[PDB]
Symmetry: C5
Subunit: 114 residues, 5 copies
């Protein structure tokens, strides 16, 4: 598996605008929300769950990087894999997207797979 | 179990006004005080105890995130489980609430379960 | 044991003015110096030593919190247990106080145990 | 082995301009892009992959340090070992370079091996 | 052994002016250069190596603390033990000093052993 696989999805020129942390089924987790820097479109919601999904190993790295980008407000590309989380109240609160990568963007390009 | 279970309680549009770290019965713990951003109402007090309860795996994640929202003074929703801690002077000094989650509320609604 | 046991000691409305990191007898340790915000009294010194004393599990947490409070310079309540470290040159330079807790304070009250 | 081995390569007076985090084959990884501080030259790209290559022990240290130098935009020397990652798509997106060290540079000199 | 031992050396009112991180013989390491805050004297260079010397257990604490004092530019007392590192090319790039302590200072008074 790889962040860059074309079976994942991504959204460029987004800014992390909200951040949540909690626990589910003994697993710490966090979710983020991103919105287009230019105000268009609809928000992206993704979560990482510390001991769930193939993406479990990068939980801490993605949490630290999400916090960094959240506090700077900079434009990023968010990479997710859709339809991973299944608990209905959780999905309805947040989404089913697993968070699989974050890429800083310049005004012209984003530094990550495309 | 989940931060968002309806057996837990939450308070929206709060700010983290105080933070304390200590140790009890060989376990690191922290507690936070929150108050409504607009000044109304009464404070909320909650603690996490590193080695205790089903919420123990989330101790570090919650301490890190509590420190961040405390340093910004931004609006948050705090999620708690009532009536778990037992040592009477600890309960009386702080509370029996376990901290089970923290959501940012930078928008109309808080980014978390309700 | 508990940070708030009345056999421990505490000092309210203190500013963490200095911070030191070193190693003693295989253990990383740190010490802080604190002074009353209002300028009165004498400094308090206290140290935490990794894997030594009953307070060892809280070492990393205390160091991170002490760093944060040092960087802001805000008024805090410092909680210690007296007469813990016995290395005589170490005590002479710093003290025998084990750091056991740190509480933020508003101008009117500190968020931590008293008595 | 050593960062400073002459079989490694290094580029002086660079700025870390972009940062990416993701996961590959169970390994969280990060990549950085750097450019000459004066605006000349061609970018350098390098990645560190957790639990992969002889450089795995230093993964967290290099991630923390690259985050710091990325946040200050200060001039640095980046040290790499070439032709380490073999996944062709990954190499094509990023580089085959393993990141092996980072040195601050003054106006006069870089504080590291040459 | 103690940071404050007779047989160690120290240099007061110094500013961390450079920082480097790398790896050697499977061990991550970092080095710092310091200069007198008032501009006098000759630089000091010291390194810490995670799996080596009797000071190995304090590697992470000293790295974190060096980073913090580096980022603020404030005046410190640096404590070293001479003649520790042995790989000649390493000593030639940096020095043989093992880093063994950091003490903050104020107006020509440092909080550490003298
Ligand atoms: C920017 C915007 O909201 N709307 C359109 C825009 O769709 C369109 O071109 C876009 O230009 C941006 C600049 O980086 C991107 O290149 C868009 O491609 C991607 C993206 O990177 O965001 C690629 C990606 O595969 C898509 N993801 C999915 C699941 O389909 C996303 C996604 O559709 C959007 O990001 C969601 O808003 O788009 C690229 O489409 C230009 C017309 O050229 O006009 C803007 O206003
Ligand atoms: C509710 C509304 O649409 N408009 C206002 C509103 O400003 C306010 O009501 C409170 O506003 C917030 C909106 O962010 C919440 O909806 C409050 O409900 C909760 C809360 O989220 O804080 C729900 C939660 O279940 C409750 N917890 C418990 C244990 O009961 C808390 C709690 O009761 C209070 O937070 C304690 O202060 O409230 C909602 O009450 C009021 C202000 O008077 O006026 C509406 O018109
Ligand atoms: C007025 C002006 O800017 N002239 C530059 C000229 O200075 C520059 O030469 C480079 O000068 C810097 C000074 O720090 C270095 O000494 C360069 O040497 C190295 C480097 O440290 O970057 C050595 C290194 O071994 C080389 N790496 C490899 C794999 O060979 C690199 C590498 O060639 C360059 O960094 C790539 O740009 O150079 C020294 O080359 C040159 C190039 O920057 O351009 C003039 O305009």
């Amino acid at each position: 598996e790889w962040t860059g696989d074309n079976t994942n999805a991504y959204y460029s020129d987004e800014v992390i605008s909200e951040l949540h942390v909690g626990q589910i089924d003994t697993s710490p987790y966090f979710c983020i929300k991103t919105v287009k820097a230019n105000g268009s479109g609809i928000p992206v919601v993704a979560c990482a769950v510390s001991k769930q999904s193939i993406w479990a190993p990068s939980f801490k790295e993605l949490l630290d990087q999400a916090r960094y980008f959240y506090s700077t407000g900079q434009s990023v590309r968010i990479h997710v894999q859709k339809n991973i989380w299944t608990y209905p109240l959780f999905v309805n609160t947040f989404s089913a997207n697993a968070l699989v990568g974050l890429s800083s963007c310049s005004a012209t390009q984003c530094f990550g797979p495309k």
